[model samples]
Target: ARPGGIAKWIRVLAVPIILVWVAIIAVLNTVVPQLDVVGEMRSVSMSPDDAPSVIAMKRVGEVFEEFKSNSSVMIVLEGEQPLGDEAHKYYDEIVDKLEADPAHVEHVQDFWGDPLTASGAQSPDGLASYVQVYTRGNQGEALANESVEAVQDIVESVPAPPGVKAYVTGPAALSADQHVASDRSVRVIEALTFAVIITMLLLVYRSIVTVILTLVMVVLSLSAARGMIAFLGYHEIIGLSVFATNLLTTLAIAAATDYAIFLIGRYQEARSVGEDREQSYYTMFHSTAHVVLGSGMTIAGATLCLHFTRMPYFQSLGIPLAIGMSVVVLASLTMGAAIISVASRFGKTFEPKRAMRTRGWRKLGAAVVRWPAPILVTTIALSVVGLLALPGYQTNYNDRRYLPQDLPANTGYAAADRHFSQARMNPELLMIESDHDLRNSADFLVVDRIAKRVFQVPGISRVQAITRPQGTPISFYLPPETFENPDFKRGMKMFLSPDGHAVRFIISHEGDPMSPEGIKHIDAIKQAAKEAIKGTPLEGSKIYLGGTAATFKDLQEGANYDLIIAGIAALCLIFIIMLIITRAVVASAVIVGTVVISLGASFGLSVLIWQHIIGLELHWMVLAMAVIVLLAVGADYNLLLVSRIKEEIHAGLNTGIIRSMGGTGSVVTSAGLVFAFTMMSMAVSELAVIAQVGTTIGLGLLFDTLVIRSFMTPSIAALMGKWFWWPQRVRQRP
Candidate 1:
């Protein structure tokens, strides 16, 4: 029996480690706060601000960056409907303020008032326009909300032209909405998690204080995890945000509480038979410590798989969750046990009206014990029913799908779809940069030829050539004065690269941005462009195909790479750990096989669902996160139940797999319920991806427990019998 004696070492080690960690974090926090880099747009490009698609793309880019800053916001207002007199009236007032004086802004761009360049600077209708004002970086953190309000005042003061209503969308609006969502999700998760945890505890001990003590431990773990994140330079953490806190809290509270419930349930049952407080803690701790520790370590290790990716966001998320789970394990073993010990010993204890409410679990146990073979068959059959849900998956890779439907960004996106016949999140603009003198007459002709060939691509609507538009504009620039005229040449130079060697070719499409149809269009454009440039000595030109959709494709591909690498890392780590913990060739083989079957079913299910039923496309990131969750969580259950079987064996009791299943039946089922309820907490969000993930991981946990852990494993273990540890016995056991 090892109570404080074994865990005392952990507490001692954690004290100095935590102190040193805390001190290092404090110093980092101080040094960095003084050099804060918030709201500093790192990648700004010059594009026509009136084009709705381009405007939407820019806002998307800004939001992506703003997620890191959290201190910047954008206020976007559109012209009122009717598209005429009313719109102009509102525009005049906004323009008047911008022209008279700029307030609370670092930089401002107003398309209505700015001198039009030859680059099609203004909107086609002229009534539709936009204004952008950047807030000063870093120092405005405290005033971020205030600054948004100040801008909002200006927005409200600006009259909406009759027929047109204005909407605000950008980094600021998205962040505000996300904050509301994060808060709601956290609140729901906490409430549901507490309800489940307390209900399970009440069933285990029939005592209220014991349940309260367990919840207290979970809260402390979360608090410690947050402090650790703050100490780890959270301001620079790419994907670490309030949502991250919610996720960490959800995972930690759910998983840790489940672990506590399992151990405490064992302890109380032992106490019912005749063990003291210290005796119960130690006896149960020794019996279950390795299982809990191994499960915790495996989860932490699986989370670390996110670090192998090139994506900094995944790393940011992975570090906190991994560390948080580690803290949860530590609390589970020490603080958790200590509080239970102290509370049960000295604190006020209240017993329920029904002190012994084991009838439900007992009846369930009796059913399992009475008809083990049928229960096993029934469980397997039910797992097949869940497997049927596999055919209902779909994928959505569109940029707009993730943003709020009511956002100004979405509005601008929709406007592009209607007003300009422009495909939002589709098309790729390749900014061709040349090093040679592009002001030459031949070079000007070459630019014209490139635009003509580019427009010929299938699905292309029209190629806008600033160099030669309206034909009159084209003749006036190139044929009228030639490249010799400084102004004519200078006008064309706007279309060329800075070094005068290359020009810009804006390619667009008319299909769905993320659909297979869209990729085919892009491929056709690329192929035609490649053929067009073959004899033009521009085959190797530095042309870049980049836009909202193209960038999303790149990001998606990178996430896929990360997902594959992370899976390999998780499998290898889990395999090695299972071998080391069990120290048996057969044990490791069975465990790995079990995970594979469950995970394989999950993947097949995901594929089927995406293709057939729900009809929402799953992102690679969602798939990656789900797989890691299944592996980490599913393996945890297998370890806890199987490890007990080993313990009973070591104690010189021949408790076969079937007997062990009956004995530990309640613990296994309770753990499954807790896990399922934990993930169900995340299902409140309207975001389909989040709900899908929460549901998948939770279902995976249940599937693994009922099918893999209970029946499939026990059946195999029964068949293996004593020979399951033959290699281990030959190597270490006498």
Candidate 2:
């Protein structure tokens, strides 16, 4: 080959020259620290203000500014034995320790200084008592991270009395524990994802040298991608989700390994003939390099399309993935190709006996060529089953459901729900802002009637408002004298704004707030709020509603629109790119059409497993993520196979199909296994959303590789014959 050829550059990238890439990787690590779990989103680029719940949340914050200034964490204690004569004495010791930081501890409320149960801190059964700690800041953007830490520190340090155990459950306490669990899960999944990548590479290549080299490429690409995303996230250039680590680790390994396998298989083939080291590398690079380049552009380009999305979360998902894919593509071209150049230093990379089983793939390819029609029919039947299950799919927008069950906040919340009045329930708060200050009996009566009307809504268990003090009607006690009195108005501030121009109410329901029943119950509650306020003095005022249920509802609605737009954008972009790569309209169409059907089957199957069998809704983001991955990667496998067939087409079309299939069969199946196993790591994640994504993608890849690629694809191509590559028809090649 001439000096201008790929072979010349291939020599330049070997050994001492490749040392430069290692130095580049080191510089990358020094430039940016390791990716941090950072607990939660450190900042928001923009929140969807037009969302129903967002509007309501904004009004509530405006109406009730006090809670925003100071956040409160309640510690509920359940005594094995009922509180005895020394209970109040024990209570002071707890409060005394908490008060050590008066700067942070604004107030501590308990039943110690008041009559039994009067403070509402002691349950009627006297078996449970709660202490409310008001800290310096509210659960605002930073989550009052420091204040909650201070409260938990003081409370946990104070030892509980004999026969009593203390559990810290509050915003900060739960936040702290969540980080611990997340940190643990990240390390575990990282180790497991890498292990799966390495194990599967060994299974396919059967060489220690090959596996180690593949890993180095994957690790170097992963670090550069993570470092870049971390830098952007730290500066708030784009929102960063906790799931980026999972995305980066698994995707990097899968992409790097798959790219490596293609190069390795082709390199070994060239070597099997009489080619020398440099010649084998050149042949492999020149022949198969475009497959990865085309696949990378489609995948990375499709992912970058997500930047058009207005939501910060989608940007986070899209940007890291795009960056990661792009990095791996570069590494694959340089480092993955370089490994083949350097492998002889470690001895024979893939010998005959140690390499993949040839007979199985050879037989498999023969079956597809012989029975192309039946194979296509069987695939259609299988795909039909997948498409049928799509309608029953649902999304779980509830963030709480994403957490593990044993979390401290949930544990204490369960105890509180059982012994006291309310669980740490997610309330549907309805905020009412009035034009005039209403401090009269007539105004109180109107609010009481509205409260009564809301209570009649079948799903609502209780409604606490300005007219219902203990979630009970206050009409009887609300004469002008009582309502206008300064002392009464002081406490009324809990529900009523200090200016008396606004008020709010809490609506409670019976089941898990994220459950189907809990979500359905919200619709009836909102209707009650609307109907009850009609024709009242408050009817002329502004009414806003916000809560967990409402937020999920709005999230689902917004996701539908966003996903549709993003999906359309991705499909169009890929279609154009595929057209250019294949250089034939029919070829691009077949590839695009089959890829969608293959992905549809994956989605349909998810409905049965997650919705029908496991009995849970898929995380709203899971399907979209799964769709994008399978969309590009599905096309990924097809392009590789299609290109190889073209290269072998000199022997009749059918012979080309069989030869291409036989030659690359192991590479296709091995690539699928490598990707499938890495995704399995996510299936076992402690976080439900990540696990759902993992399960969906892992199963989809197996079905795609084994069934779609192995069976349906070749069958489709063989049946199409000359039309499969029409216009720029296949001709006899040298």
TM-score of each: 0.78, 0.88
Query: Over the stretch 176-236, how does candidate 2's per-residue lDDT look in tens digits?
Result: 4455456668778888888787778777766777677777777876766666666666566
- Residues 700-723 of candidate 1 have per-residue lDDT tens digits of 776676677766666555556566
lDDT of 2 at 63: 66
Error (Å) of candidate 2 at residue 657 is: 0.7
- Candidate 1 lands at a TM-score of 0.78
User: What overall lDDT goes with each candidate model?
Assistant: 0.57, 0.69
Model 2 Cα displacement at 632 (Å)?
Answer: 2.4
lDDT minimum window of 10 residues, candidate 2? 38-47
Model 2 stretches astray by more than 4 angstroms: 1-7, 13-17, 37-55, 69-75, 82-126, 129-151, 161-178, 305-312, 344-360, 387-402, 420-424, 474-477, 484-487, 515-527, 604-617, 732-734
Which ranges in model 1 have alpha carbons more than 4 Å from their true place?
A: 2-82, 85-157, 168-184, 203-205, 235-243, 347-393, 415-422, 425-427, 468-477, 482-494, 497-499, 516-530, 537-540, 600-615, 650-654, 730-734
